[PDB]
Design a protein around this ligand. Structure first.
Ligand code: 1QK
Ligand code: 1QK
Ligand code: CL
Lengths: 106, 106
């Protein structure tokens, strides 16, 4: 659980502190945010909080499973949205930061 | 050139060999493939061949710059398309294979 501890103590915490992660800290509320077909279009929803619980509850067996989840969160946003959307710009900054943290992993 | 040697000799070559990389081995030809607004929508196009040239011509100073190009090629497909599209399924398999290779970089 060494790389997993990195993902939890370093990667996640660092991403969490940035305000551009705020829309990603909870599953998408399709009603409150008026995204009526969100769950019709996205089949594998993912958010940071789900990722955090999975780390807390020892859900992951290997670090690749966690990294898949992050990847799914970003691509989900790209799929659902289009270039130029605010949320996409936010997703892009999170992802960049993510990849930078990952390159430092043991 | 160490990590950049891995990206060229291991990562690029392994991805190139899969038929699902065929659509990404040349810049999108918007006319022949009848994607009229591709270049209107996508502001930063990227493909394997461009990445390959950049490695050959010693364009990247650093591993992060080349990894950034791969990420752009993936997100570009996601942004331009939508869930369930063939090209998207392809991008996803490419990206997954990409991530596994990355995890084995020095
Ligand atoms: C911290 C407040 C919050 C909670 N949910 N949420 C959402 N949910 C939609 C969503 C989230 C993640 C990925 N995808 O695809 C859709 C969007 C959003 N914002 C949209 C973009 C510009 C900032 C901003 C506006 C309103 O706070 N802010 C929030
Ligand atoms: C290997 C032949 C080829 C060359 N270009 N191209 C494209 N260009 C569009 C494109 C590429 C990369 C990212 N984005 O966003 C759009 C698509 C495509 N296909 C689409 C999906 C299922 C396979 C297949 C069908 C017809 O060969 N095949 C090809
Ligand atoms: Cl999209």
């Amino acid at each position: 659980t060494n790389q997993l501890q990195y993902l939890q103590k370093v990667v996640l915490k660092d991403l969490w502190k940035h305000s551009f992660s705020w829309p990603f800290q909870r599953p998408v509320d399709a009603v409150k945010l008026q995204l009526p077909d969100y769950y019709t279009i996205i089949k594998n929803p993912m958010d940071l909080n789900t990722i955090k619980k999975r780390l807390e509850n020892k859900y992951y067996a290997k670090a690749s499973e966690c990294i898949e989840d992050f990847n799914t969160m970003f691509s989900n946003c790209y799929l659902y949205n289009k270039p130029g959307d605010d949320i996409v710009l936010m997703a892009q900054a999170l992802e960049k930061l993510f990849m930078q943290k990952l390159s430092q992993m043991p």
